[PDB]
Design a protein around this ligand. Structure first.
Ligand SMILES: OC[C@H]1O[C@@](CO)(O[C@H]2O[C@H](CO)[C@@H](O)[C@H](O)[C@H]2O)[C@@H](O)[C@@H]1O
Ligand SMILES: OC[C@H]1O[C@@](CO)(O[C@H]2O[C@H](CO)[C@@H](O)[C@H](O)[C@H]2O)[C@@H](O)[C@@H]1O
Ligand SMILES: [Zn+2]
Ligand SMILES: [Zn+2]
Ligand SMILES: [Zn+2]
Ligand SMILES: [Zn+2]
Lengths: 64, 64
């Protein structure tokens, strides 16, 4: 358990994990829920926060 | 701001960031404070949690 919020949907950890989503981080350290990041990746290969490229799986779950 | 705790020192986010440390994640998704992970890396090249190899900078800050 943790208290972190996804900046795209603005849900808290409780709401994210209740819905079966993962907390994920880009390799540039930007944290989102899995759904928002994967959805962003359908339209853009860049980090939603800093626009560094994150395709080729330069992101991963964080187990918190 | 976030509420996460480092499993090695067991400090909360407030105490970690007050002390100038970073929150970091391994690429295997395991979250620590920077001091504990870097200290672990002096003795072992493996994740403190799952023992997957994490040297060659297979870890990074998470900005929460
Ligand atoms: O929802 C992700 C969140 O759940 C935790 C347990 O609190 O991990 C569990 O759920 C994941 C998603 O189904 C699994 O991948 C994982 O193996 C399981 O322990 C947190 O670690 C994670 O942040
Ligand atoms: O202590 C890390 C923690 O601080 C935040 C702000 O709450 O980031 C700031 O501090 C970092 C460490 O000095 C800097 O690298 C960063 O640029 C700065 O914004 C969090 O994002 C971070 O988790
Ligand atoms: Zn989200
Ligand atoms: Zn980024
Ligand atoms: Zn620690
Ligand atoms: Zn690990």
């Amino acid at each position: 358990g943790a208290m972190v919020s996804c900046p795209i949907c603005m849900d808290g950890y409780s709401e994210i994990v209740q819905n079966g989503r993962l907390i994920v981080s880009t390799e540039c350290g930007h944290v989102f829920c899995s759904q928002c990041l994967r959805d962003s990746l359908k339209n853009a290969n860049t980090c939603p926060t800093c626009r560094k490229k994150i395709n080729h799986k330069r992101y991963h779950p964080i187990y918190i």
